[PDB]
Structure formats: C-alpha cells, structure tokens
Design an enzyme around this catalytic site. Sequence first.
Site, PDB file in Angstrom:
ATOM      1  N   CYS A 196       0.831  -1.195   0.000  1.00 49.21           N
ATOM      2  CA  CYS A 196       0.000   0.000   0.000  1.00 49.21           C
ATOM      3  C   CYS A 196       0.870   1.251   0.000  1.00 49.21           C
ATOM      4  O   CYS A 196       0.583   2.222  -0.695  1.00 49.21           O
ATOM      5  CB  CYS A 196      -0.925  -0.001   1.218  1.00 49.21           C
ATOM      6  SG  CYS A 196      -0.077  -0.220   2.802  1.00 49.21           S
ATOM      7  N   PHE A 197       1.942   1.213   0.780  1.00 46.41           N
ATOM      8  CA  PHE A 197       2.850   2.347   0.888  1.00 46.41           C
ATOM      9  C   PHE A 197       4.064   2.209  -0.024  1.00 46.41           C
ATOM     10  O   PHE A 197       4.925   3.089  -0.043  1.00 46.41           O
ATOM     11  CB  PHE A 197       3.315   2.513   2.333  1.00 46.41           C
ATOM     12  CG  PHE A 197       2.191   2.625   3.318  1.00 46.41           C
ATOM     13  CD1 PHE A 197       1.003   3.233   2.960  1.00 46.41           C
ATOM     14  CD2 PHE A 197       2.319   2.119   4.600  1.00 46.41           C
ATOM     15  CE1 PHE A 197      -0.034   3.339   3.858  1.00 46.41           C
ATOM     16  CE2 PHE A 197       1.285   2.222   5.504  1.00 46.41           C
ATOM     17  CZ  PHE A 197       0.105   2.832   5.132  1.00 46.41           C
TER      18      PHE A 197
END
Length: 378
Positions: free
Chosen positions: A350-351
């Site tokens: 996600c990051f």
Amino acid sequence: LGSRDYKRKYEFFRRKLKKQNDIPNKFEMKLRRATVLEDSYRRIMGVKRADFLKARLWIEFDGEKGLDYGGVAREWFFLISKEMFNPYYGLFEYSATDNYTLQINPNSGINPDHLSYFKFIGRVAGMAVYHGKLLDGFFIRPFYKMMLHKPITLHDMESVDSEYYNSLRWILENDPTELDLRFIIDEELFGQTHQHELKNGGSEIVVTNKNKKEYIYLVIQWRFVNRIQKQMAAFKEGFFELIPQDLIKIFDENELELLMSGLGDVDVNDWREHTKYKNGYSANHQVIQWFWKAVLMMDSEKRIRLLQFVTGTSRVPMNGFAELYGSNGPQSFTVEQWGTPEKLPRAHTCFNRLDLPPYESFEELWDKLQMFIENTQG
C-alpha cells in the site's frame, strides 16, 4: 545449486511445450483495428477445437498483406490487451494496492455474457504464453495464485481490500473475545451493514482464538473467492485449453507474472534517486549503501521479484519511478529502518515501502535480503 532458477524453469517449460497433436500449419484471422475486440472474440470463440489456436499466427489488420508475422502478432496482442484490460468494460477493476494492477470485478456479471468473455481472455492469454508473446496486462497477486490453484490466505487480501486486510490482520493478532464477535459480517470492522451469517446460527456463536482461522477462512471465501469463482474459473478454463494446468505449477505466482507479462530490466539509478527514506535513513547510511550494492549486483529477475514484493507488481510505470503510486495516492518507493537484525525485512505494498533492520554486515544484509525475496513460509 538447490536454489530456484527462472531461466531454467523457462527453457524446461519450452521443451515440455510443443508436445501436441494434429495442429494445422497456421491460424487465420482477418481483423479491422477499430473493431478488433468484438472482431477477435467471435473468431476465437468460434473454433471447433481449441488446438487450432496453437498453430502459427496468421493475422491481417484491415486487409494489409505481406507484413512480418511476428510484428503483426505482437501488435495484435498489444492492441487486444489494451482493449481487454480497460475497466471501462466492467470486467476488471483496480487493486486496493496499488492502481494500474488489475483484479476481477465481482460486478462483471452485469453483462450476462461476461463468463464467455473471461473464457476468451483466458484463451488469448494462453496464446500469448504459448507463442512466446507478451500481454500488456498486469494482475493482483492472488490472481496468479488462483491460476496455480494455490490456497488464498490473509496476506493475499492486501491487494484486494485494504479495510478487509487490516481488519483481518487485527483479528488475527488480537483476541476477538472482548468484541463479542460472531460468525457474521461486522459493520464496525468492515464498514458495511448487509450483515449476514457465514455459518448457520452464526450470530449466536462467538468468535474466539479457537474459532479464529475458521471465521477468517469463511470471510475470505465469501468476500473474494466465491463471487469471483465463476469468472476466474472461466478464465482458467480458456487458458488451460492451451497451456496445461499441471505444467505451469512449476512457477510460483511471481515467476508466473513474469511468464505472462514478461520480464524486462529495471533502471537502477532512477529507482535510487526516486527512493525516499524513513526513520533516520540517509542515502549515505551504511545499511543503505549495502542495500543498493545488493540491488545492483543481483540479476534482473531478482530485482523484479523484489519489486513484486514491495510495490505489489512487476510493472514500473513508464517515465521513471517518480510516477509510482500506492494505496490511496501517489507514493514513492520508500525504505524504513525497523526492528532488530535477526528479524527478516517486511514489506507494505500500500505504501510501496520496505522495512529493514540495521544489519551490521553486507553479508548479513545480503543473506537476509534474498531470504526475503525468496518466500519460504514459517
């Protein structure tokens, strides 16, 4: 020498490939570019027996004749890829992490013929891998896992639904008892009240440390694999009409993406200058130096694999790593200092972020790093 080799798997695949019977000399298709999708479909879905599709591709765009077969073939695969993988048609939607990567749309059933289209997609993908050509499509990791008929697990949810993933991680590591959780969807946790029972009488039964894995399994089934079952099974059906199912299990999910979407190389310096750092990591920090040394020395396939573990896919967007997206909004490739040396590095797609410990040696950093890019669970 007991370690995986992708090229070996590939040439072995190739030798095991081209064992077939009663294949004609060529497969004829005449198409017009603008109409290609709907033109290809009824052609390919119109064959009496799938084996014909294994013949050398003879394709002609808009009546054009004489062109190099390889060129027109790869062009066609590119165009038809551009058409199929557009979410506009409602068949596929974007992953939670990150963006360009695709997952199947559970609502694809709006168009009643969707299953047929999925089967078609499977077929042409099968042609792409069979003829040694390239799909411009890129998929969520559990897609490749389901292709290999491998179990779907909690972490696989990461690229499906962020909320579901985090919720289920918490329910995994933390004790559900105090929340009075039952075998039913919880809007408190999942943000949706349709709430319905996973098991008969589920509302009355309470989720415990004992009933944990059962509950998680049921949730994962209902949310993902169940509603996606028909579509994915159609895809696999169309795809296995060309490439043998028992055969491809030689590859894991990553190498499989490398098979379908191909593997290129990756610009290192680009990735390096566009890399962001956290928790007091300078680019001049020793562990960072060692890290980039390692990334430099490892081959293409390994680098791409690391990308697959961090970004969530093998595709670096064109024109640099600066355009890299993750989760909700654009995120560069980040490295964060975390944990003690004996621990292995982890990743968050996600990051687009890699957490690694302050390893005290380049040898140590190396070993731990490959031990990370090579996934052997425990």
